[PDB]
Amino acid sequence: THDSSIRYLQEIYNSNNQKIVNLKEKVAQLEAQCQEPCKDTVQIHDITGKDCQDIANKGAKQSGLYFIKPLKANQQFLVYCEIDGSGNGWTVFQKRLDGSVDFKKNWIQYKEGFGHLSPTGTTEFWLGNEKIHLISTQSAIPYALRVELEDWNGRTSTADYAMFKVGPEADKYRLTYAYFAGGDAGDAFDGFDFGDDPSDKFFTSHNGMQFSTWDNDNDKFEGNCAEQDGSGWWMNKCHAGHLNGVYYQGGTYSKASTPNGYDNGIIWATWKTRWYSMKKTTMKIIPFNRLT
């Protein structure tokens, strides 16, 4: 006979069979290890406030994402706060780094804002105009607007403007500021003498200008500055300072590259030629006193 065989089979049957029960136990242990979702690196801090400065006063010690609600706002909203070692809380409302975001957005998008917020501050965006408004005018305390510029050679400059305020939608978010508080980048908001015609500097100043989009022309030009340069900015028979402009790689560009044949890059005439577009850009505010 060959009964020896059956012995083996019956044996092997229970062999793997005993292995199963323990295996079902491994699974359970495994199942437990796969319940939590992937970790999101982006995190929102617990502190709140009227603005970024207010937050730093409450002990915030790191530049990141925070929710705020100006005295005027009836709904909080997220913002990116730049906090330095000195203890200053900058509320950034505009930032440029690469050509990731298309600033050729319409009125609504410029009103509510567009782009993305990052705790690392390594992303492009435009906080809504409405938000900028609610903040800058939320109280009697005057704010200062700082404009940080960086060329394609690592060099940087700034430009401060005292009593920076953005009007309400009813006034088409008009840009106002008492005076140029100084900076090595020069005062482009005051217009630029581009030569020829004397009206130049006058027709390229930005103080007291209302905001304009392709779908909402409010410039002092018979044509449409915004549609022609593809952006959203406080235009006045166009510009001398144009931070929401088209992102040109390398910086330098000719009118050939341009569509309508005009300078539409990120320009600041007092610091560089209009045919030179910046590498990085930053518009942020902080209560004036933090500078006095």
Binding site: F194, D197, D200, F203, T204, F221, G223, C225, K237, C238, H239, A240, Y262, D263, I267, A269, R274
Partner: peptide
């Protein structure tokens, strides 16, 4: 820029 300037617009004529």
């Amino acid at each position: 820029g300037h617009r004529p």
